[PDB]
Specification:
Layout lengths: L3 H15 L7 H8 L6 H26 L12 H16 L5 H15 L2 H18 L8
Length: about 140
């Protein structure tokens, strides 16, 4: 019953908050966000995302950086940096989600907390990351 969009937004919120709470653990930050309003599957999914992003962060950050020039990853807003990380993680490691969905919903988050320009920006980066790194199993889903 809990929408995928809400589950993913919790993951995003935890990453966002972590940037200003570096002394705390990302996993615990996520538990603060997850409450009775999130169902069993959503909590399980969010927990897996956070652990997968943390485990693969170096690889993910390096990958994204190969599509950035003027705007380095640390110069982007806390919103765009973490939307790119979360989307890249989803594109590479979450098997059942179509590329279009990952990209479209990631752009929604960027626009949600930024502008149409921020969104078009992220849309551009993700389109490029996807056309070169999307897993073959997603070539048609």
């Amino acid at each position: 019953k809990t929408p995928r969009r809400r589950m993913r937004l919790a993951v995003f919120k935890a990453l966002f908050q972590h940037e200003f709470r570096r002394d705390e653990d990302l996993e615990q930050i996520l538990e603060e966000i997850l409450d009775e309003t999130y169902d069993k599957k959503a909590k399980e999914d969010a927990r897996r995302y956070i652990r997968g992003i943390k485990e693969n962060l170096s690889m993910i950050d390096d990958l994204i950086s190969r599509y950035l020039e003027k705007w380095s990853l640390n110069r982007l807003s806390v919103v765009d940096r973490n939307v790119l990380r979360l989307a890249t993680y989803e594109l590479l490691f979450e098997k059942d989600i179509p590329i279009e969905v990952t990209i479209d919903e990631a752009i929604e988050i960027a626009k949600r907390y930024g502008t149409e320009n921020s969104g078009k920006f992220v849309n551009g980066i993700l389109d490029r990351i996807a056309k070169e790194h999307a897993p073959k199993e997603k070539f048609e889903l």
